[PDB]
Amino acid sequence: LNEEERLIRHLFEEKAYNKELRPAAHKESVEISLALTLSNLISLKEVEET
Amino acid sequence: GSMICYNQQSSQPPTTKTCSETSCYKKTWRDHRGTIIERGCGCPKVKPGIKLHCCRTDKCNN
């Protein structure tokens, strides 16, 4: 626990992390990379179009 | 009649076993986390989308 708890206390208490703020400058955009894994295809309901 | 096949997973340290079959196989595929390589005996039937390499020689699946 020692280094894990120390790191959490360093990142979120000592550094005062704010989840409401973006990790970027105000005029800068954050690059989000997306991928999708299809675990399984359940159904295509024709009448309900879903 | 016997044979020596490899059977280690992916990039683990190599291991070997005794195949009573006439082929050894390497089986490669890729899920969302990375590439898996499975080595063993025979020539199994694989699902579509899986690379398969069967070979009839000692220590031939690597």
Partner: protein, 218 residues
Amino acid sequence: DYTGHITWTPPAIFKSYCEIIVTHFPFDEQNCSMKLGTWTYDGSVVVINPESDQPDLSNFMESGEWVIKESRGWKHWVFYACCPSTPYLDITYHFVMQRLPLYFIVNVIIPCLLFSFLTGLVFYLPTDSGEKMTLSISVLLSLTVFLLVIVELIPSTSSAVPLIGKYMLFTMVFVIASIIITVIVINTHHRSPSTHVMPEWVRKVFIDTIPNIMFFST
């Protein structure tokens, strides 16, 4: 406990995906699995071990439709080519189960058998009754109406043709062949000298070659 041991037994409703083989339906055997694992922790930080080789069936309620013949749990280590120091662990509990087929035997197979028996009855009904086509067409209509029952009761899967579906298609083709052959017989029965001339091969076969075996008058 005072030693730090934690036991946690939460309930859950597990909805799992399972390859269903309908080749032998309603006499099919299924093998359905539940793969469990730590989603965000790999084997190097959290090790999961099975409590027993088998899942616990002591508090298992008897199922209405299935009998669980076999059950086991297997732990799997998965290594990737990129990282040879961190395994990924899972525990897969599989259950091999057998369907009880009585419902589909009673509600699908038996009426199909009765219609198949009715199919051949039209060939003992004389043509002078004026009821051959009524009988055959009505058997076909009963089969068509029973198709509603079957589409209601049988799964709509295209992975394979169910055995019971093969029996259905066989019975359907059987009735249709009966209707075609009955039309041929009825057409033969109203052949007249004014319209047709008896071929010599028909006289050679159907008068002497076969009826000599039977007991009537040429």
